[PDB]
Design a protein around this ligand. Structure first.
Ligand code: HEM
Ligand code: HEM
Ligand SMILES: Nc1cccc(CCc2cccc(OCc3ccc4ccc(N)nc4c3)c2)n1
Ligand SMILES: Nc1cccc(CCc2cccc(OCc3ccc4ccc(N)nc4c3)c2)n1
Ligand SMILES: Nc1cccc(CCc2cccc(OCc3ccc4ccc(N)nc4c3)c2)n1
Ligand SMILES: C[C@H](O)[C@H](O)[C@H]1CNc2nc(N)[nH]c(=O)c2N1
Ligand SMILES: C[C@H](O)[C@H](O)[C@H]1CNc2nc(N)[nH]c(=O)c2N1
Ligand SMILES: [Gd]
Ligand SMILES: [Zn+2]
Lengths: 400, 402
């Protein structure tokens, strides 16, 4: 059992949860923890484990209902090769997959998750309808609510449901003749696929992409998001009057749509989930990464900072002011947002809660510590143990 | 078999083949990663010695030469007759530079080939240890134009006590524990402060009292030596546009000189081998001054900057910390004391990574310690995947001598 120390306070816990099912990339000879992407008999083992977790959560372990559900899943796997989750099992499973995600700093919220059951979905058009209801519910006119919509599970001899977009709201990136990008460089690939499937492109820096939705065994189909459904926030700064003139904006709803949800050995390749933004995601990563919008030096130069010498810390000063502008603009627009200080303090509470409830908490230090002001937050001084529990959200290959 | 290592800013990919030579095991397993943890005879010796000698003769392109063959035979005969062996001076120099080159948590390693190595393996007494340490400090400080150096005292030997420096660094500020539980001075040094008082030091009561050295010669109790004030160059902290900042009375010292690590070369162990470079400014401004369990000045600076400290969403913490770091950089430059900011230092570490891929096929690096503690993703190392492993020669943690 790993000993885990908090170096700010000196407190020690032991992770007993890590003893519980998959293997990561590290060995005794070398740590690869910094890498971004590290039978029916096997299905029943994972199914049995999940059903056991569920009957524990509803305080009916070893009960008659518990034994009958295990026998029921065995019988279904024997007759069909797969089995079907009850609605309440799906909800519990989706919440566990969030609770178990090591790279998510927002997991104090894991028990408050609205689950939309879309396992009856038949077509891409129905898929579009479910997604529009999700966006509307989750946005809630700016009072954002975490949600997930679960489309039908994978089954053998039948293609998956897939959302080709990486998120439900994404800005286009148009490759220029010189290699550079107008718009978001992260989305060049999906922008071109949208164009190759017949979308008429724009030419702005913040063009909302259409959805490419794949129903089983069909080519992907294009759907345009109604503009009144996509809430955006113009970026302005509270004292830098010129900041608004830069025309920067971001969208309200972070809705990831390319991960696979795994529950009890069942796989849901299309299960988009959404929360609300932590401000550093927008102000530091999306706007300041050199391979994203890369506007850090544009801002610093307008702040009249000395950008010809690194030791003026112009990069740090401009980055903080862009993060201030994100926080101010979302609060002004009444769109839910959390700064990195408040988010990391809540994650420290989550760690304390999970120590009492499960004996530990899988956490990826490099992803929990925010990308600015790392050691100013309490998670920096907190040792963490990284391991994979199920139910889980997993990366999956692009559908193309 | 070999890990793929990608840079996500540029998309470039390398393979770390150097990791196969990792000799020691780390704390991770396939089932859980522990990379964020701070703290993870004859035939054994001879194979470590042979590997090091082989490394040495490869570094000078004289592999398989008569000199190479003769040295391996000489070491093999020395270990059989004495149970150990002695490094040649050139081997010690190479070994010390290799240990620095191999240190996964050091962002400064672009400098690894430029290291002054003082051979103190003839030292006999604590008084003479003090002479070598003063000469080291004078050479390394160089009136502010800092030069990297290491002094290596005699190796560990069965039946004799170790040379040890009890202090964690050659220059440290005292920490005095108060009644309320708080600390006057540096909370990191409360233990060594009390140890100095228990060996007769008359303590001050300031926030920046330079501690004496506790020096231990073999089989002797530690002996207390006061550093002459002219040896210890210090930098008063001021801020280029916040004029009240200088009135705070903050200062820091020029020379970071770590004295509590063990140097291991070819199976030999040097428990006293203090080394020094120059500061990266976030060590002083973010960690030493703003850590809540250190001097913890962040909120006072924010209040003095007239920032609204009632809500976190003003990012008052971030703004105050950036200005403290500006002050450190401005003050050292004003004092003409070498310093590097975290942008220039991480840019040079990226160059080091490129050099080491060509020279050796990889480079052990600990991502959490290479990425600076403010503005992480504004530096190139943030977007660089890294492989962490243990090579030898190496600097190792070791237990406190008390
Ligand atoms: C409710 C507010 C939430 C906040 C503030 C939040 C915050 C974050 C942040 C900052 C990251 C780092 C992602 C990156 O930098 O790429 C992250 C990752 C992640 N989040 Fe959360 N999140 C929230 C809700 C959710 C929800 C509702 C789910 C799923 C039900 C979820 C699942 C995940 C997963 C799986 C990752 C892993 C990222 C990856 O592997 O690329 N989060 N979260
Ligand atoms: C010359 C300029 C140098 C710079 C800018 C530099 C920078 C740094 C920094 C920022 C750290 C992390 C410190 C922390 O946050 O606790 C570090 C660690 C380290 N440095 Fe360097 N350094 C330099 C020279 C040296 C030299 C000359 C040596 C030895 C010959 C050395 C050996 C080490 C080792 C062994 C560590 C790891 C410490 C640990 O594991 O706790 N450094 N360095
Ligand atoms: N506050 C907040 C809350 C929820 C979501 C977010 C957005 C940040 C985030 C969270 C979770 C997952 C995620 O993205 C997964 C991803 C991204 C790119 C990929 C590219 C290729 C591939 N095969 N998989 C990918 C998976 C982003 N923020
Ligand atoms: N000595 C000096 C030394 C080196 C380089 C320079 C050029 C400074 C510079 C470079 C690039 C762009 C730039 O644009 C400044 C700018 C733009 C708009 C502003 C709006 C409002 C405001 N208050 N300031 C603004 C500054 C400057 N100079
Ligand atoms: N730019 C720069 C250059 C050289 C040195 C520094 C200081 C930062 C640093 C570097 C290397 C080692 C180091 O400290 C090692 C240490 C610290 C505390 C310990 C407590 C107990 C123990 N058993 N070992 C310890 C070892 C600090 N900066
Ligand atoms: C190489 C590095 O591990 C990688 O780029 C990580 C670092 N930490 C991160 N942390 C968060 N929250 N999000 C990220 O995308 C990354 N990227
Ligand atoms: C728990 C965490 O890994 C630990 O506090 C580390 C993180 N990264 C660090 N990075 C540096 N440069 N120095 C440190 O002392 C630490 N501490
Ligand atoms: Gd002023
Ligand atoms: Zn690891």
């Amino acid at each position: 059992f790993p000993r885990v120390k908090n170096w700010e306070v000196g407190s020690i816990t032991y992770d007993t949860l890590s003893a519980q099912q998959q293997d990561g990339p590290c060995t005794p000879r070398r740590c690869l923890g910094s890498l971004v992407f590290p039978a029916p008999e096997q299905l029943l083992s994972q199914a049995r484990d999940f059903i056991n977790q569920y009957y524990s959560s509803i305080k009916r372990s070893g009960s008659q209902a518990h034994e009958q559900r295990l026998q029921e899943v065995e019988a279904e796997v024997a007759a069909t090769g797969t089995y079907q989750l009850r609605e309440s099992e799906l909800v519990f499973g989706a919440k566990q997959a969030w609770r178990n995600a090591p790279r998510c700093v927002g997991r104090i919220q894991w028990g408050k998750l609205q689950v939309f059951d879309a396992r009856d979905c038949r077509s891409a058009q129905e898929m579009f309808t479910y997604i529009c209801n999700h966006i509307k519910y989750a946005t809630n006119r700016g009072n954002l609510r975490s949600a997930i919509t679960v489309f039908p599970q994978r089954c053998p001899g039948r293609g998956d449901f897939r959302i080709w977009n990486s998120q439900l709201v994404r800005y286009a990136g148009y490759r220029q003749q010189d290699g550079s990008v107008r718009g978001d460089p992260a989305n060049v690939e999906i922008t071109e696929l949208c164009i190759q499937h017949g979308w008429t492109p724009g030419n702005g820096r913040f063009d909302v992409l259409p959805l490419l939705l794949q129903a089983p065994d069909e080519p992907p189909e294009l759907f345009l998001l109604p503009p009144e459904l996509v809430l955006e926030v113009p970026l302005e700064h509270p004292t830098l009057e010129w900041f608004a003139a830069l025309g920067l904006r971001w969208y309200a709803l972070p809705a990831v749509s390319n991960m696979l949800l795994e529950i009890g050995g069942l796989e849901f390749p299309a299960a988009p989930f959404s929360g609300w933004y932590m401000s550093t995601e927008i102000g530091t990563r999306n706007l300041c990464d050199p391979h994203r919008y890369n506007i850090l030096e544009d801002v610093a130069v307008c702040m009249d900072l000395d950008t010809r010498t690194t030791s003026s810390l112009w990069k740090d000063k401009a980055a903080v002011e862009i993060n201030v502008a994100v926080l101010h603009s979302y609060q002004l627009a009444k769109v839910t947002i959390v700064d990195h200080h408040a988010a990391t303090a809540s994650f420290m509470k989550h760690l304390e809660n999970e120590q009492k409830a499960r004996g530990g908490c899988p956490a990826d230090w490099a992803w929990i510590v925010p990308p600015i002001s790392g050691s100013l937050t309490p998670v920096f001084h907190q040792e963490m143990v990284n391991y994979f529990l199920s139910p889980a959200f997993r990366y999956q290959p692009d559908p193309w």
